[PDB]
């Protein structure tokens, strides 16, 4: 028997293609699931995870923190114009809101 090597490691992905494949089947999204479908999907999920974590890590450093907390996640998702479009209908627990005040509300001289 050949040495078992995970499909994720073969694809060079961290996300488990096997788990994604099992969920694509157990969820009954279709009668059949092509072997390429979970690989493509796992890559997209892995990429989107990196995208948010990268911006969230930057927000953490910008906050002089080493651990990402929901505040950093919200600031990342809301500061990015595309993430804010993908997650516009999504509320992040304890994330708060962007620190923005309408200029008209500020005092004038």
């Amino acid at each position: 028997r050949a040495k078992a090597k995970t499909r994720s490691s073969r694809a060079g992905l961290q996300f488990p293609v096997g788990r994604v494949h099992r969920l694509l089947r157990k969820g009954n999204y279709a009668e059949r699931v092509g072997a390429g479908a979970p690989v493509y999907l796992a890559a997209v999920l892995e990429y989107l995870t990196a995208e948010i974590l990268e911006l969230a890590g930057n927000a953490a450093r910008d906050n002089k923190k080493t651990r990402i907390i929901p505040r950093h996640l919200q600031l990342a998702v809301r500061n990015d114009e595309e993430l804010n479009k993908l997650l516009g209908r999504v509320t992040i627990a304890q994330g708060g809101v962007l620190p923005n005040i309408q200029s008209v509300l500020l005092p004038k001289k």
Partner: peptide
Amino acid sequence: KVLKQVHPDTGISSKAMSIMNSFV
């Protein structure tokens, strides 16, 4: 593991991880 790739020095709280899991 993806976090360790994009920011090896950065960690993530359980709450933030739960959000990321929900997001995924």
